[PDB]
Every structure is written in C-alpha cells, then in structure tokens.
Symmetry: D2
Subunit: 259 residues, 4 copies
C-alpha cells in the first residue's frame, strides 16, 4: 500500500530512517515529510500568523521549518501529488505512557492524519538511563510496525480512533507477546521539595513518584514492565456525549434562578 | 467557599485582576498563583529536569517562572497552607473554540486541577479584529453565577466545563446554550507564493464553506450572541473500543512466530 | 527637540512610562515604539525570514511583535512620518555593567540608532537583592539630553549610563569610567539532583575580580552615576598594518 | 600543539567533524565540547539562573545542553583535565560578514576564549543561492601552524570567511575592514491571506557600503578574507574629551 511517515525528533534522527527502510523492504511505497530539527519542548499548534519554508532532500524526502502538525497538514492539502492509504509517526527515542500522552509531539502528527480522514498509528521505544553506552534496539520496534500495517489491510478496523504503541528495549528473542491496555497515572503523588541555590535564592523541585501511584494490572505501565508490547485505543474528539443530557437540565435550573 | 485562580497570559494581565476582584466582592476567599510572563507559544508539559523559582507579590498573590500546569501542581502539593474547594482558569484575552481546544494553555491549568481531585472551569472572551475597550466585566458576571450554582448542585462525571463569552454589554446578551465542538481547519488549503528575496513560501489559508460550524456547534452559538457551555473528557482512553481491539490483537499473535 | 524612545522589558513596563512623561513635561516631542512582551532570552538579530505585525495603541504609542532592533529599524525606514534628532533606550529594571554589555538587549536598541546615523544613549537602574527609584534616573536623563543640544559631542560612539538605586539627596556626583570584569574567575560546581544524577552550576565570583579604581563597578558601589563611552565599529584599525605584513609572509610559503 | 574546538550548529553537524579530523592528521591533540542541538535563534549570554547537564560521548568528545559560551566556560574552569594553547570555532554552514558579526553565535565561542586569556579564531563557509568543507579546513591548518612559529600579540580575534569553491580556483588571501548592508533596507507594507496589514524588511539597495577594502568585496572576487576585531568595547581614545564635557555639565546643575 501507500504510506506517509513523520516524527518529532527531526529528519536526521536514527529511528525514522530505520522505520522507512523496513517498510520499503516489505514491498510498500513510502514518502517522508518531517521537521528540520528536534522539537521537544515546543508547542504543538498549527502555524497561522506567518508563512512556512520547505526543501527537497532526495526523491522521497522533504525537510520543513515548522511543527509536526504543520508537516502532515501541508503534505495532505497541496504540497505533494500523492494519495496515501495510512499515516505512521515515529520511532520515538523515549516512551510515551500514561499522563504524558495528551501533550506528546509524536502523538500530535497521528492526530492530524485522522482529522483529515485516514487511519493512523504512533510508535515509541522504552529506553532506560545508564552510565556508559548500549545501542538501542530500533530493529525490534520496526518488525512490530510492519506486521501491524499489513494486518490493518486484511482485516480493517473502524476509523474513529488512533492506536498508541510502546515497545520494550530488548532483542526479539526475549519478547513474551502483545497486550491491550488503558492509560495509567503516576504524578498525582509528587510532593514538592524546598532548596537553596548557589546565589541564595529559594528554589522548588517537583517530587519523584511514590508507591501510591496507579500502575497495576491492566495498565500500560504494568505491561511494559513485564516484557510485553502495549497497545491502547484513544479518542480523537474531546466532546463528552454521555454527559450532554444531564448538563442541559443543570443549565436550565441556572437560568431560572438568576432570571 | 475557597477558590484557587490561575491563567496563561501572566500575573499582570487585565483579565485575571478583574476576575479575582469580582469573586471577593461576592463573599469568597481567593488566592492567585500564575506565570511571570505570557506563555502563549510554549509547550504545556510539567517541568521535571530543572528546579523552579517563585516569589510573593502581595498578601494574596505569587508569580512563577514556569508553565500553567507547574502553577497549579505546586499550589496543591506544598507551596500553600490552603485547602481549596474549586479551580478557575481565565479570563483569556481571545477565544478557545473547536479544534483549538486540545492544545490551549488556559484549558491545561483546569485539567491539572481535576487530576489532583477537585472540580474545575475554564473561561475565555471572544474578541474581534479591528479604540473599543474589551468587556471583561460581562465575563466575570457569568463566572460568579456558575460558581455559586455548583456549590449546591455539583457535577458527578469525570468532566470539566469549557466556557466562551461574546464581547458585548450584559443587556445585549440573548441567553446560555449547551453545545458540541465544531471544526474549521479540515478545509484549510495550502497557498504557494514568493518572498522579497526570491524564495518559495507556503501559507495555511482560510476555510471554505465545507466547514462544520452550523446549528448545535460552539462556533454558531457565539456568532449569534449566546454564551457557549461544552462538557469535555479528562481521560483519553476509548473504553467503547476495547472489546473489538482485543479480538483483533489475538488474531495477530496467532499469525506470527516465536 | 524630537526624541524616539524604545526598551527590552516591553511597552507596558513601569520604567519606560516614567521616562517618556518626564521628557514631555520638559518641553520635547516624544514617540514610543517598543516590544509587545518581555524579550530577555531571545537573539538580538534583525528578523529577515518572516514578516512582522504592529498595533497603534494611542496617538504617540506603538506595540511591535518582534526584537528591540526590529522596533528602531521600522520606525526609521517607513512606519512613521517623523524625523528624530536622537534615540534613548530604557529605563531598565537591573544594571548593565562590564562583561554583560556586549549581549544586553537595552544596549542593542541604541546600537541600531547609530548604524543608521543618529546620536544614541542607554539608561539602567542598579537594583540590589520596596518601590524602585525610577524618578532619580529620569532626572539624570533629562539633564544629559538638554546638554547634548547646546554643547554637542561627535556622533561616532554611544554613552552607556548606570544609576544607583537611592534618593537624589544621597547622590555624590558623576564619574567617567572604563568597563570592568566579573565572570572570568567564576567556577564550575558539581552537585546532585533528586534522583542521584550529576548536574553543574556556574558559581559566584570571588575576590580576584577586576573591579577597583577607574572601573564602572567601583563608581556605583560608592554612590556616583557612571558614564562609559563605547565602540560602534568592531574593526581593530590599530592592528591592520602589522596583520598585513604577517599575511604577506604566510602567502609566500604556500606558493 | 593542544587545541579546543566548539561551534553554533551542534555536535552532530558535518563541518565540525571535518575540521577536527584535519587537525589531528596534521599532528595536534584535539578535544571537542559543543551544543546538543542547532542553536541559531537563542541569546548568546551565559546561563546563571538554572543548572546545566553534560554527557561524555567518547574519549575526546562531550555534548552540552546549553549555549556556545556555556560550552567554552565549563571546559576551561573544571570539567576537564586539559591545558589548551588556542580555541578554534566552526566551520559554520553560512557566511558571517559586516553588520552581522556582533550577534553571531560562532563568533561568541571565540570571544569567551579571549576573556579567559587565550588566543582565538572563527571560520565560516560562504554558501550561495555539496559544500566544499575540505577547502575551508586546508586554510585553517595553515593559519594555526604560522601562529606558533611566528606569533602575534594576543589582544584581538581573527574573523575568517572562505569562498565555496575548489582550491584550484582560489585567487589569494586579503586583509580587510567590516562593511555594511542593512542601513539601506526599506520597510515594505503588504497584506496576508485575509487582507490584514503586515511589514517586511526588504533587500539592500545600490547605496550599501561594499566596495574596495571591505570583507564583502574580497569574497565576491574569490579571495579568502581575514579581519582583526576588538575584544574590549571601551573606546579609550574618547576618554579625555568626555571627561571635559562632564566637567562643564556638573558646573551647570551645581
Ligand atoms: Cl514525543
Ligand atoms: Cl489559551
Ligand atoms: Cl537588558
Ligand atoms: Cl553563526
Ligand atoms: Mn521526541
Ligand atoms: Mn492566552
Ligand atoms: Mn531588561
Ligand atoms: Mn550557525
């Protein structure tokens, strides 16, 4: 089939190159449109007050001076002569779990995919802090992504949600299987710490997570801790339909009161 | 009751001062914790890799060098000797409608309130491109009535309210309306032009008539001079989809080896 | 005379208001063009790759979404029908001394005035650690501006001015000075975060600093107003003849 | 000799690797300390209000989450057991000429070297409209060897700009002064795709200062340009005149 690929770490990052290469080896057509540098720490909104620049790198690749949402939007509304079947965003160099999901740049590019009418997937590798060096297993995450893509064709899912995927950092021979999960939480517990800096000013640190967190059986945290790949289905429309009838009766009692 | 107030435009903004003064006039206790300068344009995530400064401005006010989510998190976990009943974020100097809501800084301060166990509301004024002073007093009037009403008749759901107010005098307003989110950028095309030095550039252009802004939407209410109220999710997990995705995932497993 | 006024802290800050009001009361015409928010932390360069927006607040006041150098450039090349005799930038809420002068945003607005042909002045208040003495700094500025009219200096340098944070009654006089140095000795410090990981700080300056008799630091420490004349052209003319003979020898070698 | 190398574009850029390799092959020792990502667009000041993180990549390389001035300052005040003879910053992916020199990130790393008492050089490639990084490196190693066996006084910085061509096409070296181009640049009033008013800063006209003797005219005619610049902004030659002026002022206000 025909695929469109983006990310939030930049067009020159090791994980986006390994992903696109594997997809082509498997027999697919692939075009890449991604940011000119790393965008972590930047806001995810569409750019409306100023114009945007882009340049061709090779016959299949373009570099854009804007957000991950800017990259997917321009690709689908006039930048390319191309009609894709699906959007895939990643492979990210750290995990995207629990309370981190609503503000993730990797997730924002997949969202713009569905808004414009196509199915979409985000993929992330769960790396762990060390001292020296140990090279990350991007090859392991790519093998999972090509099998997910082929299957979405032979047995299609409805088109009103996005899939968020997280992969343990090991060789494939160690993996135990797949599991379907819900979002956990881990920073409701973080109780601030008071200190003094080298020039005499009072400063504050957000605390580390305690044991009273929500990361048990059924959650995304618990699956990856036990060496399984995690898949969570998420909303694309923030409207809460199941609450409309009740809020209307509430608003009626409000207006009768004041006037 | 006891109220906690924040925003995304900054601690010296005209809109946050008018809101706080009105709440105190109606007999409530109020503490303010907000950013040291306008944050519109920055990421909304919590700050974990570095420490944060904060200082006292007057007996009821603190200025913080960090995000709107940083302000609410610190106030509720050790910064204050205070146990609030509810959180209010606003009044923002422009609207927050349709597809703009998921990444709004004003909305992010109310979300952190609910996560840590309290009811929450976001309030914005719908100003228009043009000397005509903004009607902040009109939006503050709507806010005090909503607060006193939640005190008698609370709301059960895992939900928060997003409120938008037309920029007119109170005598000119037509009523309140409950709405769904609309959309206007799915239709927005890409235009090609040339800059002063000869480089090709691209603009995201204005929406066509194939937009979703008719009867029932947030856009249609404020255009016809009504105040809009929309209830929104705080958990992004899609529960209605779990049974079908599990069937799907088991089939995949049986296909592959190892 | 006709004055143009800008700053680094924004059009809504208390020090730019107090400066513009004192100048008008003394009988000058004043236009204000300044950033829409506090700019401390971004590059001082001119904006070339995108277009810029601007909003007229009242009759003699404008708000610009860009840098301090962007404000002064637009004002002199087409935004206004106005012909100024001098540019003044300030009053800043902290000091601008010694090795901090080259990258200061307050100083950058003055620099763009001189590159385009006019005399220029920068003004800062030296706050320590309460309501700042902005009125004391404004009294110094109106007296300096009047004197430049009747008794003029050559316009190929700019004046950098720093004012101690006290009442006029306490001030001792004016003094002409050179730039000092403070960060040269400032050491690297190794500490730990709440997870046990290593982080570095740039620590405070010890007693070995360059801050004695003759410098900008010593003057304000002893309650005098400091004036330092600074370069507008970074070319080192006095080294040109010697560097030329050196380059001649280098070229004979490679050939 | 012992050399310390930094830049403004980041530790992973192609110009900094080609410079370091050419220096080692010429027989010098080299340590590299540079930013974790591209830095154009941020303030050049030292970071004082928060702490800074760093990571050792290999035996001779370090990656720092901060400014080019932060990189050089930490390297010379305790992060390393190393005693360098000179600092070199580059090779930059575009030119650094005329009125753009005071706020250049590439130039700022060289400055912090001199403030702390060593000699220093900045090198940039003049790209127009596969970049000849090798041409620029051959120029830099010849300059470094001459500074040793025939020394200059260390009270200045050398700012070097190299045309983007093959070595065979180069015409020579030339010593120059800074020119100017933006003083002429006019305000242009236009409308956005909604008819709302916007302003552009337009291109330089024929009135610009770019003739014989300037850095602009040398690189346009295929020569390598070298400009000596100030490290101290004090204008010593105006001090006596400004002292008499301030005397006459103080007699007026009594
Ligand atoms: Cl991400
Ligand atoms: Cl907002
Ligand atoms: Cl400043
Ligand atoms: Cl640069
Ligand atoms: Mn990332
Ligand atoms: Mn805002
Ligand atoms: Mn300032
Ligand atoms: Mn650069």
């Amino acid at each position: 089939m025909r695929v469109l690929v983006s990310n939030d770490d930049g067009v020159d990052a090791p994980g986006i190159k390994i992903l696109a290469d594997a997809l082509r080896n498997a027999g697919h057509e692939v075009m890449v449109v991604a940011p000119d540098r790393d965008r972590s720490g930047a806001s995810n909104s569409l750019t409306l007050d100023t114009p945007i620049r882009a340049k061709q790198i090779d016959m299949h690749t373009y570099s854009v001076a804007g957000t991950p949402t800017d990259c997917v939007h321009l690709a689908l509304t006039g930048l390319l002569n191309y009609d894709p079947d699906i959007v895939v965003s990643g492979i990210n160099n750290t995990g995207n779990l629990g309370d981190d999901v609503i503000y993730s740049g990797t997730v924002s590019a997949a969202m713009e995919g569905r808004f414009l009418g196509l199915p979409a997937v985000a993929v992330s590798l769960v790396t762990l802090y060390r001292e020296g060096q140990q090279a990350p297993q991007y090859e392991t995450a790519a093998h999972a992504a090509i099998n997910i893509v082929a299957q979405l064709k032979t047995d299609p899912l409805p088109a009103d949600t996005i899939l968020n995927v997280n992969v343990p950092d090991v060789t494939w021979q160690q993996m135990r299987g797949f599991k379907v999960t819900r979002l956990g939480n881990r920073h409701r517990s973080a109780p601030c710490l008071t200190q003094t800096d080298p020039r005499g000013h009072t400063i504050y640190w957000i605390g580390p997570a305690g044991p009273e967190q929500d990361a048990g059986p059924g959650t995304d945290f618990d699956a990856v801790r036990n060496t399984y790949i995690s898949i969570t289905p998420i909303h694309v429309d923030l409207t809460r339909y199941q609450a409309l009838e009740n809020v209307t009766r509430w608003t009626d009692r409000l207006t009768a009161h004041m006037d």
